[PDB]
Design a protein around this ligand. Structure first.
Ligand SMILES: *Cc1c(COP(=O)(O)O)cnc(C)c1O
Ligand SMILES: *Cc1c(COP(=O)(O)O)cnc(C)c1O
Ligand SMILES: O=C(O)CCC(=O)C(=O)O
Ligand SMILES: O=C(O)CCC(=O)C(=O)O
Lengths: 431, 429
């Protein structure tokens, strides 16, 4: 629960942040004249104002006030290649040479689709979208249209895009699919919901690890229930792998040996360009074959844009190969283990949860298994941690999430670990 | 008729014979994408072209055939295939840095250009597509009003998940959509009488785009503006296509203001792009710092490429003057095409506004989706294949969208090809 002591510490941290970043402060007031709250991505806003960045190369960027940071946020998993990857740049140059807005299919989209199908074991066919939000919306459109049903089972804490946000339960702006919310990792509770709703469930939509919800891994028993019951009731199991796809060459599904009926993809796979994708079992995806009678339509001006097609193919085949995925996940696992080792050795009431190269801090000693556990953790200390890391020249998400890019090296990881130890020492009274 | 069907069979066969390399590509593409397809509109029978390369207004297919691109990415491809200013903006974006995970000045600069240009947009937010923009506009309307009913129009197209071009579709996002008839004052008035109490939004294009370049009549839009205000529904103008028609879109030309406006396609400089904006008090609901703030997320919303290319698109390339000039150019072009039709007593017309136009094989008034559908669809398909054989590429549905790279030579070629079609297909006309 909130204390005056922690609130005063946060005020001090915010005040120091404010005083040290007057140019950013000024830009926020300016931006408010053209965008609501000077904002166009809700997650980028935090009090007193967000940092405005001038320039970045590799793993580093500099704000408009001259401070340099190592970027541990990695564009919420999308920024896997850093700020200036030469192979990505080469792909962009290649795309420009091919030509922009060609108003037609090129070979590049087919090559990218083949790359996706090759490495993701449950994706027989794929279609590209302009975001993970579109990918998940299309997956639900597919499920409802195929099954003829209206009910969607999702989970509290789950995030499937701007129109499918359940991070704080139901939101009035969510697309009006008939969504029933379960508790993440709750086998008995979810079993009960499927007994009530299963016969009219078009889809079960779930991340194999809550991403925005707190890097909360799904337990095998939970995913086993979803797979078993989706098949039983005739619902399509949709694994939202927008974040988890990086965890191995074939994402979480390769790791688990569990196959979803449809899989959604996004973020890094398009090489840092606008990107989403939905794919899955052949017989389901074939409903979109435009030559079929009663074919489902899937539109989108920029679905096949040359930049995404080129950068994405390079991302999957030239940079983040299946082996590179295994390697980075192993690297992330060692990193996260070291962070937790530092916590345990200092008897700190904090932990890092996640998988592979993905992690989020939680100020709690309890097992983090559902949205409730994440919310029950100390949110004041979380904010205090964010500002501390900033002062140490380390940028991660305000919510305490990192997503290791391929540009993070020993020096970056060491600085992060040292800064964590410093936080534990300096904030001992509040811990 | 059977004669038109045999002519279509012959045209498809000639296209197939002309393009065996594209045919090869299609068979391979089918192994990884449904129907070898990732945008439904790009498929046509017997198979679509695969393009190898393009520069300016021209492109080349994989069989080596060259074409002038009159399609212009369904209005998004306003700058041609290799605009130097767009290229410069891309290079500048790369110099700033990709996936910086933070705001830069560039999004603010782009937002400022958008708000400056469009008279009813006080505040704006960027999305990754026009579909996302329209979904967010509907999200805004339903959440603010607490109402469920959305009035839209048969023939209306508002994105993949909001596609009413052929009435309701089972894949459409499950908003409670009631469909009216475009330009139908009496019928729409009746619907607003019945549904006005629970109407969250009226969603309408100032000209049906995908529906056939069918201009809205003043009386129709006046009805919508008055009734939206009366019943407390948000009037949403989908200007994804129409925004190009002047510096400030259709709303500037009409002197009618929608409560929310959605944008897309060309405004992002050819990069992934969408935007929703409108009245300040409505948009302020998305200020993340306000109590009970609505959330609008999206990883690539503020992506540096779109922010840079978009700012260049509005402030350097497609200025207010450029918009006026291109629309005047397009009006002259469309008039010339219709003149050619009239001179040859051809049962066809081109409908549209400014640099946007669509052929319809009918001389009846084209005022709604019904009129578009009642026109000869067989001749429409024959026209597409004919133009291809003449090295002119436009939409299979017979729509052109003039880019800034279209010049005298291209326009002259289009006109001659139309005249040739009329003469060669006189027996079917
Ligand atoms: C980021 C994310 C999305 C949304 O993708 P966008 O490109 O931001 O629309 C969906 N699902 C998950 C699990 C994500 O992490
Ligand atoms: C193209 C279009 C859209 C959709 O924009 P996308 O980027 O393809 O999702 C919406 N409305 C209209 C009028 C359009 O023309
Ligand atoms: O490219 C797409 O998929 C949609 C294009 C479009 O909006 C149109 O039909 O005009
Ligand atoms: O950047 C955005 O708006 C979405 C990113 C996201 O899904 C997240 O919160 O991790």
């Amino acid at each position: 629960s909130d204390t005056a002591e922690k609130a005063q510490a946060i005020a001090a941290a915010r005040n120091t942040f404010a005083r040290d970043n007057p140019v950013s402060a000024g830009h926020h007031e300016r931006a408010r004249r053209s965008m609501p709250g000077g904002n166009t991505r809700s997650i980028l806003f935090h009090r007193p104002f967000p940092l405005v960045i001038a320039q970045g190369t590799g793993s580093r960027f500099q704000d408009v006030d001259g401070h340099a940071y190592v970027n541990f946020l990695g564009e919420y998993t999308a920024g896997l290649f850093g700020h200036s990857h030469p192979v990505i740049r080469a792909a962009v140059e290649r795309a420009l040479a091919v030509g922009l807005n060609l108003s037609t299919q090129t070979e590049n989209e087919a090559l990218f689709a083949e790359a996706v199908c090759d490495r993701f074991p449950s994706i027989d066919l794929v279609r590209f979208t302009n975001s993970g939000t579109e990918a998940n919306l299309m997956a639900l459109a597919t499920a409802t249209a195929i099954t003829g049903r209206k009910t969607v089972l999702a989970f509290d804490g789950g995030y499937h895009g701007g129109l499918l946000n359940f991070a704080s339960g139901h939101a009035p702006t969510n697309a009006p699919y008939h969504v029933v919310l379960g508790v993440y990792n709750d086998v008995e509770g979810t079993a009960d919901l499927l007994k009530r709703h299963g016969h009219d469930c078009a889809a079960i939509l779930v991340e194999p690890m809550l991403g925005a919800g707190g890097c909360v891994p799904a337990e095998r028993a939970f995913l086993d229930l979803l797979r078993a019951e989706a098949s039983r009731c005739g619902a399509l199991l949709i694994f939202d792998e927008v974040m988890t796809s990086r965890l191995s060459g074939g994402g979480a599904q390769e790791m688990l040996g569990i196959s979803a009926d449809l899989t959604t993809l996004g973020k890094y796979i398009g090489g840092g360009m606008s990107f989403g994708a939905f794919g899955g079992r052949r017989d389901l995806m074939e409903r979109f074959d435009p030559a079929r009678d009663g074919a489902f339509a899937h539109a989108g001006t920029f679905n096949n844009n040359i930049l995404t097609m080129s950068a994405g193919h390079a991302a999957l085949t030239q940079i983040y190969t299946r082996q590179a995925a295994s390697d980075l996940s192993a690297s992330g696992d060692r990193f996260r283990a070291n962070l937790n080792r530092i916590a345990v050795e200092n008897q700190a009431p904090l932990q890092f949860t996640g998988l592979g190269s993905l992690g989020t801090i939680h100020f709690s000693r309890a097992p983090i298994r559902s949205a409730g556990d994440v919310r029950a953790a100390d949110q004041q200390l979380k904010e205090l941690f964010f500002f501390h890391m900033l002062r140490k020249g380390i940028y991660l998400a305000p919510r305490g999430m990192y997503a290791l890019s391929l540009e993070i090296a020993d020096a970056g990881r060491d600085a992060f670990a040292e800064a964590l130890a410093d936080f534990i020492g300096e904030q001992r009274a509040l811990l």
